[PDB]
mmCIF file of all heavy atoms in Angstrom:
data_model
loop_
_atom_site.group_PDB
_atom_site.id
_atom_site.type_symbol
_atom_site.label_atom_id
_atom_site.label_comp_id
_atom_site.label_asym_id
_atom_site.label_seq_id
_atom_site.Cartn_x
_atom_site.Cartn_y
_atom_site.Cartn_z
ATOM 1 N N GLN E 1 117.792 122.782 101.383
ATOM 2 C CA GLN E 1 118.937 123.405 100.711
ATOM 3 C C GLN E 1 119.208 124.801 101.269
ATOM 4 O O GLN E 1 120.360 125.165 101.511
ATOM 5 C CB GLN E 1 118.698 123.479 99.197
ATOM 6 C CG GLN E 1 119.944 123.737 98.354
ATOM 7 C CD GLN E 1 120.476 125.153 98.473
ATOM 8 O OE1 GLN E 1 121.663 125.356 98.742
ATOM 9 N NE2 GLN E 1 119.595 126.143 98.303
ATOM 10 N N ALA E 2 118.147 125.575 101.464
ATOM 11 C CA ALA E 2 118.268 126.925 102.015
ATOM 12 C C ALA E 2 118.783 126.932 103.457
ATOM 13 O O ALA E 2 119.647 127.742 103.809
ATOM 14 C CB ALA E 2 116.938 127.654 101.926
ATOM 15 N N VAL E 3 118.263 126.020 104.273
ATOM 16 C CA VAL E 3 118.689 125.890 105.672
ATOM 17 C C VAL E 3 120.165 125.466 105.743
ATOM 18 O O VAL E 3 120.934 126.019 106.531
ATOM 19 C CB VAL E 3 117.798 124.890 106.447
ATOM 20 C CG1 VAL E 3 118.311 124.660 107.864
ATOM 21 C CG2 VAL E 3 116.362 125.386 106.511
ATOM 22 N N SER E 4 120.552 124.498 104.911
ATOM 23 C CA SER E 4 121.937 124.015 104.870
ATOM 24 C C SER E 4 122.924 125.104 104.442
ATOM 25 O O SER E 4 124.024 125.189 104.984
ATOM 26 C CB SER E 4 122.067 122.793 103.951
ATOM 27 O OG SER E 4 121.994 123.160 102.583
ATOM 28 N N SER E 5 122.525 125.924 103.472
ATOM 29 C CA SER E 5 123.341 127.063 103.034
ATOM 30 C C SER E 5 123.501 128.093 104.147
ATOM 31 O O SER E 5 124.588 128.636 104.334
ATOM 32 C CB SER E 5 122.741 127.730 101.792
ATOM 33 O OG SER E 5 122.835 126.876 100.664
ATOM 34 N N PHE E 6 122.416 128.358 104.874
ATOM 35 C CA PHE E 6 122.458 129.250 106.040
ATOM 36 C C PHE E 6 123.413 128.716 107.103
ATOM 37 O O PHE E 6 124.234 129.467 107.636
ATOM 38 C CB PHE E 6 121.059 129.444 106.639
ATOM 39 C CG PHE E 6 121.048 130.222 107.924
ATOM 40 C CD1 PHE E 6 121.192 131.599 107.909
ATOM 41 C CD2 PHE E 6 120.885 129.581 109.146
ATOM 42 C CE1 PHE E 6 121.180 132.326 109.089
ATOM 43 C CE2 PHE E 6 120.873 130.300 110.329
ATOM 44 C CZ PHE E 6 121.019 131.677 110.302
ATOM 45 N N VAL E 7 123.298 127.422 107.394
ATOM 46 C CA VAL E 7 124.160 126.761 108.377
ATOM 47 C C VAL E 7 125.629 126.810 107.948
ATOM 48 O O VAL E 7 126.491 127.148 108.759
ATOM 49 C CB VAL E 7 123.712 125.301 108.646
ATOM 50 C CG1 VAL E 7 124.734 124.545 109.491
ATOM 51 C CG2 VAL E 7 122.374 125.295 109.371
ATOM 52 N N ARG E 8 125.903 126.485 106.684
ATOM 53 C CA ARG E 8 127.273 126.528 106.154
ATOM 54 C C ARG E 8 127.895 127.912 106.328
ATOM 55 O O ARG E 8 129.031 128.024 106.795
ATOM 56 C CB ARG E 8 127.327 126.137 104.672
ATOM 57 C CG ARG E 8 128.735 125.787 104.194
ATOM 58 C CD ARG E 8 128.920 125.942 102.688
ATOM 59 N NE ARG E 8 129.176 127.329 102.284
ATOM 60 C CZ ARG E 8 130.348 127.965 102.374
ATOM 61 N NH1 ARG E 8 131.434 127.365 102.870
ATOM 62 N NH2 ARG E 8 130.438 129.229 101.962
ATOM 63 N N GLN E 9 127.147 128.952 105.960
ATOM 64 C CA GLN E 9 127.625 130.332 106.081
ATOM 65 C C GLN E 9 127.983 130.690 107.524
ATOM 66 O O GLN E 9 128.987 131.369 107.760
ATOM 67 C CB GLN E 9 126.604 131.343 105.530
ATOM 68 C CG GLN E 9 127.149 132.770 105.486
ATOM 69 C CD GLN E 9 126.181 133.788 104.922
ATOM 70 O OE1 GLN E 9 125.056 133.930 105.402
ATOM 71 N NE2 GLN E 9 126.629 134.529 103.913
ATOM 72 N N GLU E 10 127.161 130.246 108.474
ATOM 73 C CA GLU E 10 127.431 130.492 109.897
ATOM 74 C C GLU E 10 128.712 129.803 110.376
ATOM 75 O O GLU E 10 129.478 130.393 111.146
ATOM 76 C CB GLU E 10 126.238 130.074 110.770
ATOM 77 C CG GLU E 10 125.015 130.970 110.616
ATOM 78 C CD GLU E 10 125.282 132.410 111.026
ATOM 79 O OE1 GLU E 10 125.629 132.650 112.198
ATOM 80 O OE2 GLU E 10 125.160 133.307 110.171
ATOM 81 N N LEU E 11 128.940 128.573 109.914
ATOM 82 C CA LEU E 11 130.178 127.852 110.223
ATOM 83 C C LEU E 11 131.388 128.445 109.497
ATOM 84 O O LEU E 11 132.455 128.583 110.093
ATOM 85 C CB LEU E 11 130.041 126.356 109.912
ATOM 86 C CG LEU E 11 129.078 125.588 110.831
ATOM 87 C CD1 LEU E 11 128.726 124.220 110.269
ATOM 88 C CD2 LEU E 11 129.628 125.452 112.246
ATOM 89 N N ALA E 12 131.224 128.803 108.225
ATOM 90 C CA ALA E 12 132.304 129.442 107.454
ATOM 91 C C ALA E 12 132.721 130.792 108.054
ATOM 92 O O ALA E 12 133.900 131.132 108.074
ATOM 93 C CB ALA E 12 131.889 129.617 106.002
ATOM 94 N N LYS E 13 131.732 131.554 108.518
ATOM 95 C CA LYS E 13 131.948 132.785 109.298
ATOM 96 C C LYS E 13 132.731 132.473 110.580
ATOM 97 O O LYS E 13 133.699 133.156 110.910
ATOM 98 C CB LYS E 13 130.585 133.433 109.619
ATOM 99 C CG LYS E 13 130.591 134.605 110.596
ATOM 100 C CD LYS E 13 129.250 134.788 111.313
ATOM 101 C CE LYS E 13 128.278 135.719 110.590
ATOM 102 N NZ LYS E 13 127.599 135.100 109.419
ATOM 103 N N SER E 14 132.295 131.430 111.282
ATOM 104 C CA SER E 14 132.904 131.002 112.549
ATOM 105 C C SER E 14 134.396 130.652 112.488
ATOM 106 O O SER E 14 135.121 130.893 113.455
ATOM 107 C CB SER E 14 132.136 129.804 113.127
ATOM 108 O OG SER E 14 132.896 129.111 114.109
ATOM 109 N N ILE E 15 134.854 130.077 111.378
ATOM 110 C CA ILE E 15 136.216 129.512 111.324
ATOM 111 C C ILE E 15 137.348 130.552 111.391
ATOM 112 O O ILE E 15 138.457 130.232 111.820
ATOM 113 C CB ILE E 15 136.397 128.522 110.127
ATOM 114 C CG1 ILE E 15 137.591 127.585 110.350
ATOM 115 C CG2 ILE E 15 136.556 129.241 108.791
ATOM 116 C CD1 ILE E 15 137.520 126.714 111.598
ATOM 117 N N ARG E 16 137.055 131.792 110.996
ATOM 118 C CA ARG E 16 138.010 132.910 111.118
ATOM 119 C C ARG E 16 137.716 133.844 112.309
ATOM 120 O O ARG E 16 138.306 134.918 112.416
ATOM 121 C CB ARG E 16 138.067 133.679 109.792
ATOM 122 C CG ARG E 16 138.804 132.897 108.715
ATOM 123 C CD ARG E 16 138.431 133.298 107.299
ATOM 124 N NE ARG E 16 138.849 132.266 106.344
ATOM 125 C CZ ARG E 16 140.099 132.060 105.923
ATOM 126 N NH1 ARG E 16 141.112 132.812 106.356
ATOM 127 N NH2 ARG E 16 140.342 131.089 105.051
ATOM 128 N N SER E 17 136.841 133.406 113.218
ATOM 129 C CA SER E 17 136.478 134.172 114.414
ATOM 130 C C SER E 17 137.584 134.156 115.461
ATOM 131 O O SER E 17 138.608 133.487 115.296
ATOM 132 C CB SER E 17 135.201 133.601 115.041
ATOM 133 O OG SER E 17 134.143 133.585 114.105
ATOM 134 N N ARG E 18 137.363 134.904 116.539
ATOM 135 C CA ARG E 18 138.255 134.893 117.698
ATOM 136 C C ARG E 18 138.304 133.506 118.342
ATOM 137 O O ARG E 18 139.381 133.033 118.695
ATOM 138 C CB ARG E 18 137.814 135.931 118.734
ATOM 139 C CG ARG E 18 138.831 136.168 119.844
ATOM 140 C CD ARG E 18 138.316 137.137 120.900
ATOM 141 N NE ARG E 18 137.073 136.665 121.515
ATOM 142 C CZ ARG E 18 136.974 135.716 122.451
ATOM 143 N NH1 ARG E 18 138.049 135.092 122.933
ATOM 144 N NH2 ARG E 18 135.773 135.385 122.917
ATOM 145 N N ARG E 19 137.138 132.879 118.499
ATOM 146 C CA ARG E 19 137.039 131.503 118.997
ATOM 147 C C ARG E 19 136.023 130.710 118.150
ATOM 148 O O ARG E 19 134.813 130.880 118.314
ATOM 149 C CB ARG E 19 136.656 131.494 120.482
ATOM 150 C CG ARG E 19 136.972 130.177 121.181
ATOM 151 C CD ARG E 19 136.482 130.156 122.618
ATOM 152 N NE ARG E 19 135.021 130.258 122.694
ATOM 153 C CZ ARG E 19 134.159 129.269 122.435
ATOM 154 N NH1 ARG E 19 134.576 128.054 122.075
ATOM 155 N NH2 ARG E 19 132.851 129.494 122.542
ATOM 156 N N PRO E 20 136.513 129.858 117.222
ATOM 157 C CA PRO E 20 135.588 129.129 116.335
ATOM 158 C C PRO E 20 134.706 128.045 116.985
ATOM 159 O O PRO E 20 135.178 127.282 117.837
ATOM 160 C CB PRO E 20 136.526 128.472 115.308
ATOM 161 C CG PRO E 20 137.773 129.280 115.343
ATOM 162 C CD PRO E 20 137.912 129.738 116.762
ATOM 163 N N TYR E 21 133.441 127.990 116.557
ATOM 164 C CA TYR E 21 132.567 126.844 116.817
ATOM 165 C C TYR E 21 133.244 125.583 116.244
ATOM 166 O O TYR E 21 133.465 125.480 115.026
ATOM 167 C CB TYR E 21 131.190 127.019 116.144
ATOM 168 C CG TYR E 21 130.232 128.018 116.780
ATOM 169 C CD1 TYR E 21 129.909 129.218 116.141
ATOM 170 C CD2 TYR E 21 129.593 127.734 117.990
ATOM 171 C CE1 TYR E 21 129.009 130.126 116.706
ATOM 172 C CE2 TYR E 21 128.689 128.634 118.565
ATOM 173 C CZ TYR E 21 128.397 129.835 117.919
ATOM 174 O OH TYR E 21 127.505 130.735 118.478
ATOM 175 N N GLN E 22 133.589 124.648 117.128
ATOM 176 C CA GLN E 22 134.128 123.352 116.721
ATOM 177 C C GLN E 22 132.951 122.365 116.680
ATOM 178 O O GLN E 22 132.784 121.539 117.581
ATOM 179 C CB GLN E 22 135.213 122.890 117.706
ATOM 180 C CG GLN E 22 136.593 122.663 117.109
ATOM 181 C CD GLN E 22 137.547 123.793 117.447
ATOM 182 O OE1 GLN E 22 138.382 123.666 118.344
ATOM 183 N NE2 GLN E 22 137.402 124.919 116.754
ATOM 184 N N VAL E 23 132.115 122.486 115.646
ATOM 185 C CA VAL E 23 130.873 121.707 115.535
ATOM 186 C C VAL E 23 130.709 121.159 114.124
ATOM 187 O O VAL E 23 130.801 121.903 113.153
ATOM 188 C CB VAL E 23 129.628 122.567 115.857
ATOM 189 C CG1 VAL E 23 128.363 121.715 115.886
ATOM 190 C CG2 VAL E 23 129.783 123.282 117.192
ATOM 191 N N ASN E 24 130.445 119.857 114.027
ATOM 192 C CA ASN E 24 130.123 119.197 112.759
ATOM 193 C C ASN E 24 128.655 118.808 112.771
ATOM 194 O O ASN E 24 128.133 118.419 113.816
ATOM 195 C CB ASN E 24 130.981 117.949 112.576
ATOM 196 C CG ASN E 24 132.461 118.252 112.591
ATOM 197 O OD1 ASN E 24 132.975 118.928 111.707
ATOM 198 N ND2 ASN E 24 133.151 117.758 113.601
ATOM 199 N N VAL E 25 127.992 118.918 111.621
ATOM 200 C CA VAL E 25 126.554 118.644 111.532
ATOM 201 C C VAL E 25 126.169 117.803 110.316
ATOM 202 O O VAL E 25 126.856 117.809 109.289
ATOM 203 C CB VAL E 25 125.705 119.946 111.509
ATOM 204 C CG1 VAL E 25 125.938 120.773 112.767
ATOM 205 C CG2 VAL E 25 125.993 120.790 110.271
ATOM 206 N N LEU E 26 125.055 117.086 110.463
ATOM 207 C CA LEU E 26 124.308 116.533 109.339
ATOM 208 C C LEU E 26 122.916 117.148 109.370
ATOM 209 O O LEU E 26 122.290 117.209 110.431
ATOM 210 C CB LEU E 26 124.182 115.017 109.439
ATOM 211 C CG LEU E 26 125.465 114.189 109.467
ATOM 212 C CD1 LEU E 26 125.119 112.737 109.766
ATOM 213 C CD2 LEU E 26 126.227 114.311 108.156
ATOM 214 N N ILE E 27 122.444 117.602 108.209
ATOM 215 C CA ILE E 27 121.098 118.141 108.063
ATOM 216 C C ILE E 27 120.305 117.191 107.181
ATOM 217 O O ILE E 27 120.613 117.035 105.997
ATOM 218 C CB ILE E 27 121.112 119.556 107.454
ATOM 219 C CG1 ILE E 27 121.770 120.529 108.439
ATOM 220 C CG2 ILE E 27 119.694 120.036 107.133
ATOM 221 C CD1 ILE E 27 122.182 121.850 107.829
ATOM 222 N N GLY E 28 119.300 116.555 107.781
ATOM 223 C CA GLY E 28 118.366 115.680 107.078
ATOM 224 C C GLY E 28 117.024 116.378 106.957
ATOM 225 O O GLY E 28 116.395 116.710 107.970
ATOM 226 N N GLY E 29 116.594 116.610 105.717
ATOM 227 C CA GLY E 29 115.331 117.295 105.449
ATOM 228 C C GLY E 29 114.544 116.679 104.311
ATOM 229 O O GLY E 29 115.120 116.074 103.404
ATOM 230 N N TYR E 30 113.222 116.823 104.378
ATOM 231 C CA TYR E 30 112.332 116.464 103.272
ATOM 232 C C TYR E 30 111.821 117.740 102.607
ATOM 233 O O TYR E 30 111.114 118.538 103.230
ATOM 234 C CB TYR E 30 111.155 115.607 103.747
ATOM 235 C CG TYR E 30 110.377 114.992 102.602
ATOM 236 C CD1 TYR E 30 110.737 113.752 102.073
ATOM 237 C CD2 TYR E 30 109.293 115.659 102.030
ATOM 238 C CE1 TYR E 30 110.032 113.192 101.016
ATOM 239 C CE2 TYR E 30 108.582 115.104 100.976
ATOM 240 C CZ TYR E 30 108.957 113.874 100.473
ATOM 241 O OH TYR E 30 108.258 113.327 99.426
ATOM 242 N N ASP E 31 112.192 117.919 101.342
ATOM 243 C CA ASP E 31 111.733 119.051 100.544
ATOM 244 C C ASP E 31 110.304 118.774 100.061
ATOM 245 O O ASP E 31 110.078 117.896 99.222
ATOM 246 C CB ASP E 31 112.684 119.283 99.361
ATOM 247 C CG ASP E 31 112.504 120.644 98.716
ATOM 248 O OD1 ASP E 31 111.351 121.067 98.518
ATOM 249 O OD2 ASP E 31 113.521 121.291 98.400
ATOM 250 N N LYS E 32 109.349 119.522 100.605
ATOM 251 C CA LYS E 32 107.930 119.353 100.268
ATOM 252 C C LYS E 32 107.566 119.860 98.865
ATOM 253 O O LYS E 32 106.577 119.408 98.286
ATOM 254 C CB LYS E 32 107.047 120.037 101.319
ATOM 255 C CG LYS E 32 107.150 119.428 102.717
ATOM 256 C CD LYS E 32 106.396 118.110 102.846
ATOM 257 C CE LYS E 32 104.894 118.321 102.991
ATOM 258 N NZ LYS E 32 104.165 117.043 103.206
ATOM 259 N N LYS E 33 108.357 120.789 98.326
ATOM 260 C CA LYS E 33 108.159 121.289 96.960
ATOM 261 C C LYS E 33 108.563 120.254 95.911
ATOM 262 O O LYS E 33 107.800 119.982 94.984
ATOM 263 C CB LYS E 33 108.944 122.587 96.733
ATOM 264 C CG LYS E 33 108.911 123.105 95.298
ATOM 265 C CD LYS E 33 109.551 124.480 95.155
ATOM 266 C CE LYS E 33 108.529 125.608 95.193
ATOM 267 N NZ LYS E 33 107.950 125.834 96.544
#
């Protein structure tokens, strides 16, 4: 969840940039907690 939120923020930051990252992702993780 934390990694996905970090990733989302980086992409959300990117979309209003001078040249946006045109990248789509899936994050598959196992939460050990």
